Design a protein around this ligand. Sequence first.
Ligand SMILES: CC(C)n1nc(C(F)F)cc1C(=O)Nc1ccc([C@H]2[C@@H](O)CCCc3cncn32)c(-c2ccccc2)c1
Ligand SMILES: [Zn+2]
Lengths: 275, 76, 277
Amino acid sequence: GSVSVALHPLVILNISDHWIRMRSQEGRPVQVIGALIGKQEGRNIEVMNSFELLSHTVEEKIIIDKEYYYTKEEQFKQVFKELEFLGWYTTGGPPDPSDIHVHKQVCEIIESPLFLKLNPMTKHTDLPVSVFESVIDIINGEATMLFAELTYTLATEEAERIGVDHVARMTENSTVAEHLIAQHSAIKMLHSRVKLILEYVKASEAGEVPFNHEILREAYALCHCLPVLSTDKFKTDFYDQCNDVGLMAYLGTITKTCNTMNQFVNKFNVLYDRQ
Amino acid sequence: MLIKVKTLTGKEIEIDIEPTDKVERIKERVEEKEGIPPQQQRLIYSGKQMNDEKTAADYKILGGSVLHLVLALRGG
Amino acid sequence: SIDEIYKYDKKQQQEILAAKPWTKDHHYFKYCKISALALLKMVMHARSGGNLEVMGLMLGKVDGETMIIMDSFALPVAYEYMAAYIENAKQVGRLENAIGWYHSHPGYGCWLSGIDVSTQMLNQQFQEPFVAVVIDPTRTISAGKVNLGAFRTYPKGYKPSEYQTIPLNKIEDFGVHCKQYYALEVSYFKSSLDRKLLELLWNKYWVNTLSSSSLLTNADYTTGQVFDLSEKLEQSEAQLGDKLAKATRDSCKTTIEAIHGLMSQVIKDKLFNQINI
Ligand SMILES: CC(C)n1nc(C(F)F)cc1C(=O)Nc1ccc([C@H]2[C@@H](O)CCCc3cncn32)c(-c2ccccc2)c1
Ligand SMILES: [Zn+2]
């Protein structure tokens, strides 16, 4: 990593739920302020579970209601032993002078604060890019610090992965379609990656891009690895699995047929033989 | 004077006491309200559990303080 | 726009709480709607203890026969710490109150223990809307699917199977305390809009999906399902001579899962093995 920022998917869901709850409560969308915590290892961010930090949003000014955050500090310290304050989050578009003022207020508490600006009104494919944090630029006279965007990573643990998969579309639209849409999306993105690699190879062949001797070697290795497990033992195991699933389907088509036959005889016994 | 105790679910009960009343009297009043035994019930004010020997001298509200009722098993 | 799960209506909640419709009929609550955040935080806390046991509270409201859960907060643990942390529910700005408690069973199935059912009895007796969630971390990690444990209990002195995987030790506790609680059908709700848009981070993985290694990840789960289906069908036959419909539904779901795994394997074989032959 070049900037060592690692966001967790739980934070995004936390911010989304906060924003949706406030929007429903107050009728219209409203800007929210939060507090990202995590683990710092010198040059690592590793954001994790975030809490409310309501503070104030009065008129056009944000007041310092950080005493509530101070009370929340010892509260969250009881359930998160190895977690410390790292930054704060917001909901909106580009950074604003109000964001600068709130960041100046936050730097009073911590020396290295972040600034997440999850945008919920976005209508473009790639995800809103998390945090625009800065090293604070200083010039003669007024500080007039800005934000220098640096990249983020979506490192996630196994429990988070399972939870995210469960929330995502997985098992009116039938279960076959829901199961197949996930595979369709995964194959679609894999196909896009492979197609762009092929486009780069074609561009290098024609001469649009300079010839990099290592990218094409890696591409040749990738092409050579393409026939994955083509052994006779793999085929035997695959056919064994297919036969097992076929038997498991037969046992259950039989069950459905038995159920329908039972319904048929139940309806037949009350129509012809009235006893 | 006349305070309100709320459970976790949000159920409110309005119990009337006197300034010299003890916390055991609070628990007995809640018992007569619902039926919770005093040993299976914990009272919290301002995020701190009340001690079972102090007669509400620092809990002076004069305006119906909100108390928090937490059910707990006998002896933990 | 659907949604409408949010916007906590205070008047309706007070009306339904004062009416107390679940006092007359004991089988009032049948459906439990856990949120996305609730599940995420619950599973994260359950796995953040490993083999140790964790427990916390879960906040939500009640609508008709359904119990909706919107949030859940962990607890430090029996001492004064838990009671001090309980004040979080009324300290923050949130209108959801509290609806129940969740607690993890790391490797002991999903049932309710005797102390668990006694605490649920007490909680239901003096806090009318309450449900217990008994999720299992080890099983969801190993099998890749989340198993739910909404297990509201019966009242005292009243008289009116799914995850039976406990091999030897705790199965005895299961048998004695089995008719003292009834499971609730868990039906997950997604708020749509913001969360439906932001669920594209799942698509960012795209590798665990393309190499899922199913049909062996949860082989024990399917064997247990078939083992339960066997005496479910035997009970249906004994009654026949509608449990048969339930047995047919269970068989259909198990078979559908198996065929979905086979379809994923076939797709992977067509994608990777059938190239450059
Ligand atoms: C909701 C909380 C505050 N609560 N309310 C009331 C009620 F009395 F009001 C009562 C309670 C409450 O903490 N119960 C409880 C009971 C038993 C256990 C352990 C106990 O058996 C020990 C064996 C393991 C176990 C498996 N299943 C329940 N346990 C726990 C518990 C679960 C996980 C972590 C820590 C504690 C909590
Ligand atoms: Zn338990």
